[PDB]
């Protein structure tokens, strides 16, 4: 019934994924992407400093998927992380871990490329992990790595997944992640950012994530959330705190697209209601003074 042996080859892995995918609701693509992300996260979790503290913390949509589970989260394309070391070292250690392998998975990591960053002294880098299972190509995962900002890597949450255990790979999965206060600060900054007129802010999906994060935030963590928000907004030195949650004209359908699959949750169903919910959250954070 549950597999007592790991998949012998890629085809067995795929066949088990489709079985698990049907067996519990999910489009086969979303489950495969989740599993690929977990494998990458496992390589990332082997990166530690000489005290054993993580060098890489997961953030963004992959973090929320780990926190809440596939059913209760948005689909994340990116595997985004914050790094406590320069990217050359991070990339080298990922490459070593990916060659050594884990539970039959190996990975190649492509070349990190800078992306346009206004408020980062060190800009984020993007690259890709090409995963194989037992020497056979399995999937590709986009990775994004940004540098530490203020105290957003001072502590971490640890989230687990059992998706690999479902297909007969028993090793425990435990992923270090940025804490909710700093996730809120970064998403609030991103969703209220004004972008130079060549490109426009398409980040309506951050209004969904911020509502999901608000539901997870402990009331006793409201004051550290304010401190994190102040820190990020002052470090990036762009628009000031507290921000106004503005909606752009193309956001109504973008927001609706980000809600798809989250009907069972109490979320704003329209971008107007979402902007109002997030603005009330901003006001609540701003009042939690030290
Ligand atoms: Mg095969
Ligand atoms: Mg199965
Ligand atoms: Mg299926
Ligand atoms: Mg370094
Ligand atoms: Mg690349
Ligand atoms: Mg700080
Ligand atoms: Mg900690
Ligand atoms: Mg962000
Ligand atoms: Mg508090
Ligand atoms: Mg505090
Ligand atoms: Mg105004
Ligand atoms: Mg806005
Ligand atoms: Mg919808
Ligand atoms: Mg709609
Ligand atoms: Mg509120």
From TrEMBL:
Mg(2+) 16 binds at residue 254. Mg(2+) 10 binds at residue 157. Mg(2+) 8 binds at residue 111. Mg(2+) 22 binds at residue 267. Mg(2+) 20 binds at residues 262, 265, 269. Keywords: Calcium, Metal-binding, Nucleotide-binding. The modification Phosphoserine is found at residue 76. Mg(2+) 12 binds at residue 202. Mg(2+) 1 binds at residue 3. Mg(2+) 13 binds at residues 221-223. This is Nucleotidyl transferase AbiEii/AbiGii toxin family protein. It comes from Mycobacterium tuberculosis (strain ATCC 25618 / H37Rv).
């Amino acid at each position: 019934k549950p597999y007592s042996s790991p998949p012998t080859n890629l085809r067995s892995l795929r066949d088990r994924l489709t079985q698990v995918a049907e067996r519990q609701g999910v489009v086969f693509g979303r489950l495969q992407r989740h599993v690929a992300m977990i494998v990458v996260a496992q390589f990332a979790a082997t990166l530690t400093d000489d005290t054993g503290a993580p060098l890489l913390l997961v953030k963004g949509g992959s973090s929320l998927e780990l926190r809440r589970g596939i059913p209760d989260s948005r689909t994340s394309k990116d595997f985004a992380t914050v790094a406590r070391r320069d990217i050359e070292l991070i990339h080298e250690q990922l490459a070593d871990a990916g060659e050594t392998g884990w539970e039959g998975f190996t990975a190649i990591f492509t070349a990190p490329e800078e992306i346009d960053v206004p408020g980062m002294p060190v800009k984020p880098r993007r690259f890709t992990a090409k995963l194989s299972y037992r020497g056979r190509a399995f999937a590709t995962v986009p990775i994004e790595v940004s540098s530490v900002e203020a105290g957003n890597a001072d502590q971490f949450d640890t989230l687990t997944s059992d998706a690999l255990g479902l297909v007969g790979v028993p090793a425990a999965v435990a992923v270090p992640c940025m804490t909710i206060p700093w996730q809120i600060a970064q998403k609030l900054h991103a969703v209220t950012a004004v972008l130079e007129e060549p490109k426009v802010n398409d980040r309506a999906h951050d209004l969904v994530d911020l509502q999901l994060l608000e539901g997870l935030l402990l009331d006793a963590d409201l004051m550290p959330t304010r401190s994190a928000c102040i820190a990020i907004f002052e470090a990036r030195a762009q628009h000031p705190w507290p921000p106004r949650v503005a909606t752009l004209p193309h956001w109504p359908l973008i927001y609706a697209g980000a809600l798809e699959g989250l009907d069972h949750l109490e979320l704003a169903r329209t971008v107007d209601a979402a902007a109002q919910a997030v603005q009330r959250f901003v006001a609540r954070i701003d009042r939690a003074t030290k």
